[PDB]
């Protein structure tokens, strides 16, 4: 457990809808550096289920193209923590959200020597929210991040932030 900030009292139904990946950071440069980097993902929409799982729509650059992806993050016993099903079991943690403006989340690999970690600042609108970005930078201050990206409003309105 690298990340030690989770949202108390998270109501997952209230994160439904449209989001923008305004800023991203990761523990290793290689996780975000190229357009095709493994955790360079651009959130489109969050769809919580009635049983409280979380369907994620996002874009990712794969094979010289911007591809649509649909991911399912299954709930755990902790409201703020979800598990993505993949070869390596990947936890999604919601750090902080106000539902109406911003949501901060991190994804971490369960076990790895110096396990990898990416975090995003999501916002509801294609605007630079300095307040959400300050909350994101404060949340990351002790995490061992080595790359950070952020996107301008023009980019946020383009597929894969071109
Ligand atoms: C509550 C906020 C949840 C947003 C979580 C987004 C998780 C994104 C995980 C994507 C991991 C890469 C998938 C693409 C691939 O399999 O190549
Ligand atoms: Cl659990």
Curated annotation (Swiss-Prot):
It holds the Pfam family Lipocalin. The keyword Nucleotide-binding does not apply. It is found in: Secreted. GO terms for cellular component: extracellular region. Keywords: Allergen, Disulfide bond, Milk protein, Retinol-binding, Secreted, Signal, Transport. Under physiological conditions beta-lactoglobulin exists as an equilibrium mixture of monomeric and dimeric forms. Interaction with LMBR1L which mediates the endocytosis of LGB has been observed in PubMed:17991420, but not in PubMed:23964685. This is Beta-lactoglobulin. It comes from Bos taurus (Bovine).
